[PDB]
């Protein structure tokens, strides 16, 4: 039993809700919140911009030190950093950005990072400003993640379409 409330159950392990991931994180304080990161951990917009804003830019400060030490992430890769005031940990995961020409096959590799964590709050990878089809992202999530994932979808219209089209 966990504190996630109001989710629709899609499969044994995947749950979905129309919610602002920022507000959801502040309420549950999950062990892991997933960020829709880029390889430079530049949290300018989309989910990342919103999460970072909620940390008063502390996420960005921490991320800049991470990059200075380690260099950029790989597309499809991840790193674990602090969750600041939102969660114990933030799993920064880089899905492919279609608006940069990146290979959509890397979306499966991106979701594989979730399997290293028993329970996660997450957005749909490569959705929004990353330019992928969210219906496809949900399909890859369900077919790749085996741990317990609670998906937050900001747009109500999109949430309803994802549910109504789910196989
Ligand atoms: O819906 C999708 C599909 C893929 C990415 N994506 N976005 C989100 C957004 C979100 N929260 C949010 C929304 C608007 C905001 N403005 N300022 C802060 C802030 C926070 N929570 C979950 N997914």
Task: Check which CATH number belongs to the domain holding 122 and give it.
Answer: 3.40.220.10
With CA atoms as reference, report the closest residue to 100 among 67, 63, 126: 126
- How was it solved? X-ray
| Ligand 1: centre distance to CA 155 (Å) | 7
Residue 154, token pair as written in the block: 């900001």
Asked whether residue 89 is assigned to any structural domain, the reply reads yes
CA pair distance 71, 64, nearest whole angstrom: 10
Assigned domain for 147 exists: yes
Quote the domain boundaries for residue 35.
8-163
Query: DSSP assignment, residue 56?
Result: T
Q: Determine contact, residues 128/36, Cβ cutoff 8 Å.
A: yes
* Cα distance between residue 137 and residue 117, in whole Å: 19
As to burial, measured by CB atoms within 10 angstroms (0-12 exposed, 13-18 middle, 19+ buried), residue 4 is: middle
Task: Please give the helix or strand (H or E) that residue 149 lies within, else none.
Answer: strand 148-153
Q: Among the atoms of ligand 1, which is closest to the Cα of residue 46? A: 7
39 in a domain, yes or no?
yes
CA distance 64 to 66: 5
Tell me the CA–centroid distance for residue 75 and ligand 1, in Å: 21
In degrees and rounded to multiples of 5, residue 101 shows phi and psi of 85, 20
Ligand 1 centroid, distance to 46 Cα (angstroms): 6
DSSP state of 120: E
| 105 CB neighbour count, 10 Å cutoff | 10
Checking DSSP bridges between strand 8-9 and strand 14-18, what pairing results, if any? antiparallel
Residue 29 in domain: yes
Tell me whether residue 17 is in a domain: yes
For the chain, the domain total comes to: 1
List of long-range contacts for 7-12, beta carbons under 8 Å, 24+ apart: 7/150, 8/163, 10/138, 10/142, 10/166, 11/142
The whole-angstrom separation of Cα 142 and Cα 77 is 18
Q: Is the dihedral of CA 114, 60, 128, 29 positive or negative?
A: positive
Q: Is the CB of 106 under 6 A from ligand 1?
A: no
Cited resolution, angstroms: 1.0
């Amino acid at each position: 039993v966990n504190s996630f409330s109001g989710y629709l159950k899609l499969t044994d392990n995947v749950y979905i809700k129309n919610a602002d991931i920022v507000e959801e994180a502040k309420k549950v304080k999950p062990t892991v919140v997933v960020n829709a990161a880029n390889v430079y951990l530049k949290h300018g917009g989309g989910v990342a911009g919103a999460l970072n804003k909620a940390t008063n830019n502390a996420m960005q400060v921490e991320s800049d030190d991470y990059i200075a030490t380690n260099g950029p992430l790989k597309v499809g890769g991840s790193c674990v950093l602090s969750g600041h005031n939102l969660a114990k940990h933030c799993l920064h995961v880089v899905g492919p950005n279609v608006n940069k020409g990146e290979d959509i096959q890397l979306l499966k590799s991106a979701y594989e990072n979730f399997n290293q964590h028993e329970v996660l709050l997450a957005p749909l990878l490569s959705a929004g400003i990353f330019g992928a089809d969210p219906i496809h992202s949900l399909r890859v999530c369900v077919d790749t993640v085996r741990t317990n994932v609670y998906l937050a979808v900001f747009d109500k219209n999109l949430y309803d379409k994802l549910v109504s089209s789910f196989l």
